[PDB]
């Protein structure tokens, strides 16, 4: 005994029941890019934080 | 004392080229006075930058 639904015996109509899950993606146009190296002492901000 | 300011380059009348021609006409950007101080705006670094 395990308590989890691993394998179910289901009716056809109701193959598409286990979609309830949200998904958000991104559109083609856009780009992703990672700023982890920008990390370097020696710039400057052009304002200056408090 | 330097500044920036638009300005025209004269256009004088040619109604008569003798009297025209017998005064020195010129024009420099040479100022006699430094403008009112209510109407200078001060420009720094750190203005520009923000």
Do not use: C
């Amino acid at each position: 005994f395990i308590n989890k639904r691993i394998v179910e015996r289901v009716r056809v109509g109701q193959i598409l029941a286990v979609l309830n899950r949200r998904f958000v993606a991104y559109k083609g146009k856009m780009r992703i890019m990672d700023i982890t190296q920008s990390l370097k002492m020696g710039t400057k901000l052009a304002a200056p934080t408090v | 004392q330097v500044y920036m300011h638009r300005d025209m380059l004269p256009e004088p009348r040619l109604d008569d080229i003798e009297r025209f021609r017998q005064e020195g006409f010129y024009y420099t950007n040479m100022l006699e006075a430094p403008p009112e101080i209510d109407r200078v705006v001060q420009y720094t670094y750190e203005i520009a930058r923000l």
